Ligand SMILES: O=C(O)c1ccc(-c2nn(C(=O)c3c(Cl)cccc3Cl)c3ccc(Cl)cc23)c(OCc2ccccc2)c1
């Protein structure tokens with residue numbers, strides 16, 4: 196449908212907007228995680244006392260961490276929404292469909308971009324100023340410990356693809372413009388956009404990872420991992436809500452999960 | 455891989471697909487469209503009674519429950535078990551498969567058959583019903599969907615998937631490679647040696663990509679769209695398992711001869 200130079204033009208547009216919309220890119224996250232730098236070193240939270248000193252440097256503990264995750268997730272939804280509006284064609288769609296695409300897309304994107312902040316040992320927090328260990332997260336009390344770990348399980352697998360931000364920008368766009376979301380009114384204009392986004396992703400991956408055979412297909416197979424984990428996540432929230440009333444969700448998240 | 459080798463792999467898989475499965479999509483479509491020998495139509499109780507009397511569909515004959523919705527439900531189980539052997543035979547023709555670790559062969563088949571059965575079920579389905587007994591019968595969607603509370607809602611999601619999947623208008627040469635790709639999934643739990651499985655899937659994906667470009671040149675990004683269907687397949691298979699457990703925990707008019715239970719477990 197589109198010519199090669201237009202596909203490169205679209206990749207560059209989406210990368211540029213991705214940089215403008217998201218505060219902490221994978222490039223910066225990797226520089227902090229690998230280290231070698233004295234200025235970008237995070238403070239590491241691995242236990243209670245280090246959590247106590249960290250809140251000085253940058254309610255029950257598992258709740259406080261959980262609320263920390265909701266708060267950043269809500270911020271992520273805002274950033275994702277701002278990015279979505281820059282995807283060519285998105286704002287021109289029926290307004291109910293705009294809501295529907297975001298409703299079902301934000302969680303799959305949050306998981307994707309969370310991986311950029313992760314390695315096998317923990318996750319960056321507070322715009323990269325802190326690093327909270329995986330083992331500490333998994334050791335939180337009964338419901339919450341195992342609520343944290345699946346995010347890491349996805350991230351190590353997804354990060355083995357070695358995508359960079361310019362790849363992720365198009366991949367994220369492809370997720371949003373999914374015509375198979377429930378309740379869409381005009382699937383066809385959404386698929387026309389995804390077709391160009393898919394063409395753009397395909398060419399991008401061929402040029403940026405010429406040695407990574409069938410990375411396109413392998414990356415699309417990860418969209419399978421994203422559906423299931425989002426589903427598990429929702430089922431865990433419902434269970435936690437049924438026990439914890441010292442918890443309450445941001446109305447933005449509340450609406451997303453309803454029906 | 456070179457272009458002609460991918461065509462060789464496509465043709466190998468197409469030939470094997472034809473020999474392994476009883477009723478192809480091409481022939482199933484001829485029956486459903488009404489082109490073809492009209493199949494016997496099961497649209498209610500009395501027509502089921504006459505079909506099992508006149509044609510004697512072997513998955514739909516007495517054995518143990520007299521209740522019809524249970525009998526149809528079990529008939530789907532019985533045919534699924536036949537298909538497993540057909541899929542298993544097809545798997546052995548996939549280049550490289552028999553050379554894998556034997557436990558991995560079992561693991562891949564174990565975790566793949568559900569996704570493949572759903573996929574191939576669509577070939578026998580349209581929006582109005584499903585072919586049975588190698589195309590000799592046609593059971594209507596309305597009759598299946600109207601079976602009493604648990605069983606009606608167990609049948610309908612299969613049609614809903616099939617209708618969406620059939621809109622891709624894949625033919626048998628497409629499906630043969632697609633089924634192969636499902637089998638060679640390296641993320642199945644308990645695999646011992648993932649690398650040779652992904653190596654094979656990589657070849658199969660290349661062949662599927664080229665096949666779809668040549669067979670559907672007008673169908674932009676059909677490759678990507680078909681891989682996105684593997685999302686639908688994963689989800690529906692998980693739902694299906696959750697649906698069975700509820701039936702097992704509620705229905706106790708379901709007991710068969712213990713040997714039958716072992717076979718059709
Ligand atoms: O910076 C970011 O882009 C971003 C995006 C997502 C999360 C995150 N969300 N999350 C959920 O459970 C969740 C999700 Cl996926 C979606 C909606 C609501 C919720 Cl509540 C997590 C569970 C475990 C972990 Cl390790 C992280 C998350 C995130 O955590 C940073 C964090 C970690 C520890 C303490 C404080 C802050 C950062």
Ligand SMILES: O=C(O)c1ccc(-c2nn(C(=O)c3c(Cl)cccc3Cl)c3ccc(Cl)cc23)c(OCc2ccccc2)c1
Nearest residue numbers: 526529530531533534537568571572574575584586609612
């Ligand atoms: O000939 C075939 O290729 C083939 C493949 C799959 C099915 C089938 N399986 N099935 C499951 O629930 C199921 C599945 Cl998808 C996967 C694994 C196990 C199970 Cl148990 C069905 C549910 C509803 C319907 Cl309408 C059909 C199926 C099949 O039914 C033929 C049939 C229909 C009605 C009465 C008796 C027999 C034929």
